[PDB]
TrEMBL record, chains B, F:
Keywords: Membrane, Metal-binding, Monooxygenase, Oxidoreductase, Transmembrane, Transmembrane helix, Zinc. It comes from the Bacteria. It is an enzyme of class 1 (oxidoreductase). This is Ammonia monooxygenase/methane monooxygenase, subunit C family protein. Its EC number is 1.14.13.25. The keyword Signal does not apply. Cu(2+) 1 binds at residues 112, 116, 129. Pfam families: AmoC (PF04896). Cu(2+) 2 binds at residues 183, 187, 201. Cu(2+) 3 binds at residues 183, 201. One of its GO terms (molecular function) is metal ion binding. The chain crosses the membrane at residues 6-24, 44-67, 88-109, 129-151, 163-182, 202-223. The keyword Oxidoreductase applies.
């Protein structure tokens, strides 16, 4: 919900999310929904964005309508920030537990230590039930099961109310007598030295001693109870395992890419060389959360969001099967209302008119090749 | 008569209006108010922004102009009892200014913090800012200017000169409103983060300090109160 | 002017209450702006309430307004609660926002978004100032106590959140699990300025070393803001703006 | 000149230096880019230059070689991930107006000091 | 590298995406001169009126 | 007589000398002046540097010594007409100082910028700097010191004390010349770039501000002018 | 490995071995882009003749 505002070229060239899947579309309170997929870090990382040396796999949602039970980057849990390598492909997995009823647009996002949020595709997930049913039980290493929704709430309330009452008692004790104008006049006209006299000093000594003693005894009591504590666990986690993808057998060279201003279409000319030993066909072009598909080649069955999916948004001038060894040049037009709805046409406002995307080539057997393209994007007006 | 029931209205108008504003933003925060490019956002928050800016400009003009036009020309021939009444009215104005300062600089500003930690920033005109930067800040600016003008035009102590602590108390908090330019510039160019303690926010901090001139202002109002109606009782 | 002694007393009492309201809520607004934009990030999140950065920073930047308000109130009225009124106003504003917006608007739990406790430090600052009225003695000893008592004052609240938990194979405190579970879309984990360990961190000294550094810098900041408040208490008039 | 004229007229009218520092400095900061737009607008016409999109000013900087001034030295708008919509110029203008208020306030007193007429008995 | 000829012969034609060919040696020069001279004249008029 | 034709010479000498200097550097900028290790550079620019430094030292000594030796011992018995004549002469000196300040701090300093964006820096003694740091800066320093000395030794208003604005106006711009050490240090150790707005250059900025003491200096000269020959006409 | 355990004045002792830089380098420690092979000793009780 925070995208459609970021620079179109930044959205095009930061991180490409693909193979995304959502376990459920409608969940009850306390039920779990799992978000899986792969994200690829673009080689041409924009220079004003710091390299993802410190990155956090976040969830884009309107507050804790879900609680992030687990999140994985490469199979291992990542509660802290992680280091990602430019050009690598990682598979991720986020597990969410429903907490608040309603229709929530859940995004998979990545936060970078020096570049801000990289928001992936968002899917509407419906939560049904009541928030009062939500439970977050946690078992500690000391052998007690607590509910994280209300654990320590009473203690926090008690201590804050107690200290507030102490401060209010101090102020009220001094506020029983006249406060501002008589005291100002007494201080002004000659020495004051009458507005602070015993037992006011005794009361101040009592307040100071009681405050120090109460703090010390409360700390000692909170040491006896909860004798085992650990500091906050933090620190960037290195060694994120990337995916060992096979080298693509398709080489694509982009010879110019243009988009009409105004318009909802992007046109590019590609020289595709088919290596390997299978006839391939271009089936999908993904640029920035928007998937332009050729329905004659590939159909989406993973429940991708409708506003981001163009079922027939990809048109190839010659999409006949490309025999192995054969190289041909085709005109590829990616046209959908999403190009303007998500402001990919606002790249004309950007100070770097360059695009990046993913091309998916499918053979007869159905196995697919992921080839990555990037080129300058030239607007056309006349 | 002296202190009359204008104090009750001064508290109640701010309380009721800001409770309604809080209800409005709790209703339209999500659901037409998350996406800044949806048509419903334009009708529920951009229209709010336009209406509130126009109403604030009109109200400021009307209030300040009326206070300046009804200014007391013959301040010399003013009875001490009427001076006490006017001092109490100015204290009511200061109470209203304090209430507005609370609502603007604490409630809606830390509420802007809730939003600036829970959702991805989408524009310079999110609901939170519209309710804070362009509603509550102008409201307390209007109240402070009105209090200063009333003091200068009705109280002989605050006449024959511009009070420095009063001017600082009135203008420094106002400087937070043009400081919004630093906030937006410091959030889009500087600091690709949502750190609430970033140096991009010290502009509010610097000009939030100038509200400490309320101490000099209040001792000045105490002296104005204790001009003729000082005693006796006090210091005797 | 005034009719009699009794009506003068009544008028003074009414002025007292109204001016107390004015002082309290102007201080609430200004102090809350300063606090939330200088230490609010640590004050927002239990998983941000650490032993190095939170303990170091909060007293240093929070001793500002108490110093100025003390320098005004004690000097002009012999009223020894400038620090207490500053801290109480900050706490009231913070708590109102936490309950009605952090938990009201959004639904972050209170045990996750509770604020820090500062009344013990405020009480030390006020009593050490009234006793031995020396402002220098206050700036040295009371500011020391203000810096030192911060973490022990907050320990009864945050101690239960530091119970270790085995969370999916990784050691996490309860506060870490709270920060992990309750998603802050705008606040990723790396933004957390907390103690992460160094190669020059000797033994078990992070909290005390931070507390003593905070006490010393609190001495410095109190000394500066005493004169800042002295300037803000001026009663000059200008002939032309 | 437009900003200077605003600063001078807003100062003569309403002789208040505080009013000048707040309003005239605002106008000085805000009118800068619109004042220069008629000059630099023709240099922002897009050009397809050897396959890359460049404005006329970019082509000027590329063609006319500055041996001591490489391209990376150019501190210009390069885009961020927190740059929302079409707001770079107005946001910069308003930040400049606010900081212009601050700098005007400081330099008013700096000039006040520089206008002193004191004499020293010994250097 | 030796260059022979005259600097007056140098041309730097550029074709824009809006469909116009301009010479980068003198493109926008007249407009720049006009606007700067106009604003300078405005400032000079102000100062001279007061002078 | 009053204001005589010394003003024409004061303008013309600087204009002609600096036009010749500009011609010289336009002729020997390239072609014996690009390569700092070529023998021709030593004969066309190092010799220029040596000659100009010696001539500047000699001229400063001669001018300041003559002005101090011919100082007016009996300033008390000075007629108002002669005071007016001396005030006009001091104004001529100030005009010459302003012209020299222009040539040094604007023309040749931004010209140093042209060179510090067009060619790779080869030494601390490029033609541009030699013409600016070691010619124009010493020239305006000499002119400013001479103007200060003339005021102190001929004008009773500027006698019996050292004028603070005059001293600042005369010395602050001088401090730019020793500030060249920061320029060279900040260009070789700091900032491997040719950024003209780098903090290594704020030393000229800081001491370029001190030329604003010309305002206090000029109101002091106005008061000196209006001592006996103030009226009448003015203020009547 | 250490060549000698007890040495006389002016005698040489050689310390050899291998060190491996951990892949999961802690984030608060800067990467060893600039590192110095030092000797931990109470002052110059030995002089570092050579280090490789
Ligand atoms: C210092 C001078 C301050 C000046 C600025 C004042 C701003 C006022 C609010 C702007 C509203 C806007 O712009 O929006 C207009 C809204 C849009 O809602 P709607 O779609 O019509 O839904 C139905 C309306 N509900 C959702 C509010 C139920 O509708 C309206 O007409 C109603 C606006 C009522 C405002 C007056 C009540 C305030 C509380 C009572 C105590 C004073
Ligand atoms: C003391 C404060 C008083 C406020 C008075 C405001 C008057 C506005 C006049 C029209 C300007 C205009 O229309 O132009 C604004 C341009 C729009 O830029 P654009 O959309 O990128 O392109 C150009 C598109 N045109 C050609 C259609 C214009 O710049 C901006 O983005 C600035 C807009 C944000 C202003 C925030 C002010 C907040 C005030 C709060 C008061 C309580
Ligand atoms: C009543 C009079 C006698 C006592 C006086 C106090 C002496 C020290 C007591 C240490 C107790 C303890 O617990 O040690 C200190 C514990 C660590 O302990 P460790 O992990 O065992 O360290 C093992 C190593 N040792 C055996 C050498 C300790 O934390 C600290 O490093 C705290 C360091 C604080 C530094 C800043 C101090 C600034 C002082 C300013 C004064 C104006
Ligand atoms: C007028 C001034 C009043 C000051 C009152 C001080 C109360 C004493 C608190 C005990 C500290 C403690 O118990 O140890 C230090 C702990 C840190 O522990 P941790 O790292 O979180 O370990 C977690 C495990 N726990 C729960 C067992 C701790 O707290 C602090 O870092 C605050 C250190 C400040 C103490 C300085 C006192 C020295 C005397 C002052 C001299 C001029
Ligand atoms: C003007 C200066 C006067 C000095 C007065 C000192 C009184 C100490 C009171 C007991 C505190 C205590 O016992 O607690 C100190 C705690 C220990 O923390 P811990 O070991 O991590 O855990 C908690 C372990 N308990 C539960 C057993 C305590 O914090 C510290 O590490 C701070 C210790 C360093 C203090 C350095 C002071 C140097 C003074 C120099 C004077 C010339
Ligand atoms: C005459 C009285 C009514 C008008 C009052 C002004 C209201 C705002 C008008 C916006 C016009 C426009 O063009 O929008 C603003 C355009 C962007 O536009 P966009 O790309 O469509 O953004 C889409 C998202 N939205 C629909 C939410 C806009 O630039 C800006 O972000 C400018 C931001 C400036 C921030 C600093 C302001 C400091 C103010 C200081 C006051 C003392
Ligand atoms: C006394 C004060 C006088 C101020 C006069 C202002 C003239 C109006 C200029 C229109 C701006 C515009 O048209 O849009 C904004 C454009 C930026 O556009 P761009 O990003 O370069 O887009 C390129 C495409 N163009 C050519 C279509 C733009 O200019 C600016 O950034 C300057 C913004 C400052 C406007 C603030 C005015 C708000 C009212 C002030 C309230 C207190
Ligand atoms: C405040 C006190 C300032 C003191 C410093 C003054 C510096 C003077 C210049 C240094 C020259 C140098 O050093 O170079 C010596 C040059 C080297 O050129 P050349 O190879 O002989 O070629 C032939 C000479 N042309 C190339 C100049 C034609 O030749 C000379 O003899 C001529 C130097 C003439 C300087 C006097 C004329 C100035 C303009 C007229 C108005 C005053
Ligand atoms: C954040 C740091 C603090 C900011 C404020 C600094 C105040 C410094 C003092 C100052 O500005 O001097 C006041 C003059 C204008 O008043 P004057 O006309 O000098 O008043 C004459 C009577 N008097 C000699 C007894 C003072 O000053 C002027 O020349 C005009 C500017 C007035 C600025 C003060 C008001 C600021 C309100 C926010
Ligand atoms: C050389 C530095 C060593 C520390 C001394 C610094 C204190 C100086 C403060 C000062 O200037 O004097 C203010 C008051 C004056 O009150 P007196 O009327 O002198 O009271 C004397 C009786 N008394 C011992 C109970 C105080 O006297 C006091 O401030 C209180 C004196 C009692 C010391 C303990 C008070 C502080 C409690 C934390
Ligand atoms: C509470 C803050 C709201 C804004 C008011 C700040 C202005 C204060 C300036 C000030 O101290 O007064 C200086 C002059 C005094 O001139 P007067 O002799 O009062 O002229 C009154 C007739 N007039 C309305 C045409 C001006 O009066 C003026 O400065 C001009 C007053 C007219 C307002 C518009 C002038 C500014 C134009 C941009
Ligand atoms: C860039 C920031 C501004 C720099 C200038 C700061 C000026 C601060 C005031 C100052 O320095 O005081 C002057 C004294 C020397 O003069 P005095 O012998 O005090 O003059 C006696 C007569 N008087 C009391 C009416 C002044 O000071 C001394 O003790 C000797 C130093 C004189 C420095 C002023 C001249 C600087 C010329 C560039
Ligand atoms: C001194 C500041 C008081 C701020 C109280 C506040 O924000 O109230 C809104 C909140 C909203 O929560 P709730 O009461 O459950 O009503 C929800 C209605 N909306 C969502 C519109 C706020 O609770 C109330 O309305 C209580 C009334 C307090 C009167 C001083
Ligand atoms: C009064 C203390 C001010 C200290 C300023 C500060 O903390 O700045 C941190 C920042 C370091 O940037 P960093 O925290 O790494 O920002 C990370 C996020 N990005 C890269 C998007 C800015 O440094 C600067 O850029 C210069 C600040 C000048 C202050 C007048
Ligand atoms: C108020 C400062 C005037 C600066 C003018 C200047 O630098 O002139 C040098 C430049 C040199 O270009 P140009 O005239 O073509 O003669 C070239 C001769 N060189 C190459 C030696 C400069 O043009 C002139 O000599 C015109 C005379 C203006 C008299 C105020
Ligand atoms: C009044 C504002 C001063 C701000 C200083 C500044 O911009 O410094 C930039 C520089 C950052 O260096 P950078 O711009 O990256 O320089 C790149 C070129 N090299 C690496 C050769 C220096 O920081 C420093 O080295 C400290 C400056 C101390 C000022 C008192
Ligand atoms: C940094 C603290 C400086 C406070 C200024 C106080 C000036 C008082 C002059 C009367
Ligand atoms: C930062 C601006 C400070 C200007 C100094 C002015 C001092 C005036 C004293 C007479
Ligand atoms: Cu969304
Ligand atoms: Cu990719
Ligand atoms: Cu290893």
């Amino acid at each position: 919900h925070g995208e459609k505002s970021q620079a179109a070229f930044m959205r095009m060239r930061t991180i490409h999310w693909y193979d995304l899947s959502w376990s459920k579309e409608k969940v009850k309170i306390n039920e779990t929904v799992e978000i899986k997929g792969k994200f690829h870090v673009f080689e041409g990382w924009p220079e004003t964005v710091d390299e993802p040396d410190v990155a956090f796999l976040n969830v884009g949602m309107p507050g804790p309508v879900f609680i992030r039970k687990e999140s994985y980057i490469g199979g291992q849990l990542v509660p802290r920030s992680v280091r990602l390598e430019i050009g690598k492909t990682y598979d991720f997995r986020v597990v969410l537990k429903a907490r608040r009823p309603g229709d929530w647009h859940v995004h998979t996002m990545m936060n970078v230590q020096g570049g801000g949020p990289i928001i992936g595709p968002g899917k509407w997930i419906t939560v049904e039930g009541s928030m009062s049913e939500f439970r977050n039980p946690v078992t500690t290493l000391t052998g007690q099961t607590v509910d994280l929704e209300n654990y320590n709430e009473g203690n926090t309330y008690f201590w804050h109310a107690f200290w507030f009452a102490i401060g209010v008692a101090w102020i009220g004790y001094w506020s029983r007598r006249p406060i501002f104008i008589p005291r100002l006049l007494m201080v002004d006209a000659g020495r004051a030295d009458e507005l602070v006299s015993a037992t006011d000093r005794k009361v101040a000594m009592g307040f100071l001693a009681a405050t120090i003693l109460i703090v010390v005894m409360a700390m000692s009591s909170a040491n006896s109870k909860y004798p085992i504590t650990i500091p906050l666990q933090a620190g960037t986690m290195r060694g994120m395992k990337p995916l060992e993808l096979p080298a693509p057998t398709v080489s694509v060279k982009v010879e110019d890419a243009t988009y009409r201003v105004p318009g909802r279409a992007m046109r590019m000319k590609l020289t595709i060389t088919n290596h390997g030993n299978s006839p391939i066909r271009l089936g999908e072009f993904y640029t920035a959360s928007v998937r332009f598909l050729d329905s004659d080649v590939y159909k989406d069955t993973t429940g991708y969001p409708e506003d981001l999916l163009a079922e027939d948004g990809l048109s190839v001038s010659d999409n006949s099967p490309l025999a192995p060894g054969e190289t041909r040049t085709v005109d590829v037009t990616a046209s959908d209302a999403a190009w303007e709805v998500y402001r990919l046409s606002d790249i004309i406002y950007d100070p770097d008119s360059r695009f990046a995307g993913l091309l998916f080539f499918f053979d007869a057997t159905g196995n697919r090749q992921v080839v990555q393209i990037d080129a300058p994007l030239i607007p056309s007006f006349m | 008569l002296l202190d009359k029931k204008w104090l009750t209205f001064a508290l109640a108008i701010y309380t009721v209006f800001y409770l309604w504003v809080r209800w409005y933003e709790g209703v339209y925060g999500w659901s037409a108010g998350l996406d800044s490019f949806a048509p419903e956002f334009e009708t529920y928050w951009m229209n709010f922004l336009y209406t509130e800016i126009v109403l604030e400009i009109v109200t400021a003009s009307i209030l300040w102009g009326y206070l300046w036009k009804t200014r007391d020309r013959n301040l010399a021939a003013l009875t001490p009892r009427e001076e006490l009444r006017r001092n109490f009215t100015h204290l009511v104005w200061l109470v209203a200014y304090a209430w507005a300062i609370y609502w603007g600089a604490s409630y809606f500003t830390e509420q802007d913090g809730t939003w600036h930690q829970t959702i991805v920033r989408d524009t310079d005109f999110t609901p939170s800012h519209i309710i804070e930067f362009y509603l509550s800040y102008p409201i307390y600016i209007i109240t402070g200017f009105a209090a200063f003008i009333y003091a200068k035009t009705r109280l002989p102590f605050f006449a024959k000169g511009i009070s420095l602590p009063y001017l600082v108390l009135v203008v420094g908090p106002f400087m937070i409103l043009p400081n919004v330019g630093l906030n937006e510039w410091g959030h889009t160019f500087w600091f690709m983060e949502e750190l609430f303690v970033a140096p991009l926010h010290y502009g509010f901090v610097i000009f939030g300090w100038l509200a400490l001139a309320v101490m000099g202002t209040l001792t000045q109002t105490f002296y104005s109160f204790a001009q003729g109606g000082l005693g006796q009782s006090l210091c005797e | 002017a005034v009719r009699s002694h009794a009506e003068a007393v009544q008028v003074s009492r009414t002025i007292d209450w109204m001016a107390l309201f004015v002082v309290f809520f102007v201080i609430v607004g200004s102090y809350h702006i300063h606090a939330m934009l200088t230490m609010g990030d640590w004050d927002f999140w239990s998983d941000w309430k650490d032993r190095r950065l939170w303990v170091t920073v909060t007293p240093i930047v929070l001793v500002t307004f108490p110093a100025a308000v003390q320098s005004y109130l004690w000097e002009r009225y012999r009223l020894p609660w400038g620090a207490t009124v500053c801290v109480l106003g900050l706490l009231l504003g913070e708590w109102i926002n936490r309950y009605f917006n952090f938990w009201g608007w959004t639904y972050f739990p209170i045990n996750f978004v509770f604020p820090a406790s500062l009344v013990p430090g405020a009480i030390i600052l006020d009593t050490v100032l009234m006793l031995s009225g020396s402002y220098l003695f206050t700036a040295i000893v009371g500011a020391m106590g203000w810096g030192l008592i911060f973490y022990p004052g907050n320990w009864p609240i945050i101690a239960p959140l530091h119970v270790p938990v085995e969370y999916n194979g990784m050691l996490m405190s309860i506060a870490d699990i709270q920060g992990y579970n309750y998603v802050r879309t705008g606040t990723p984990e790396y933004i957390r300025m907390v103690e992460k360990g160094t190669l020059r961190t000797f033994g078990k000294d992070v909290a005390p070393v931070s507390a003593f550094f905070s006490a010393f810098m609190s001495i410095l900041i109190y000394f500066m803001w005493h004169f800042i408040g002295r300037w803000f208490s001026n009663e000059r008039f200008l002939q032309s703006t």
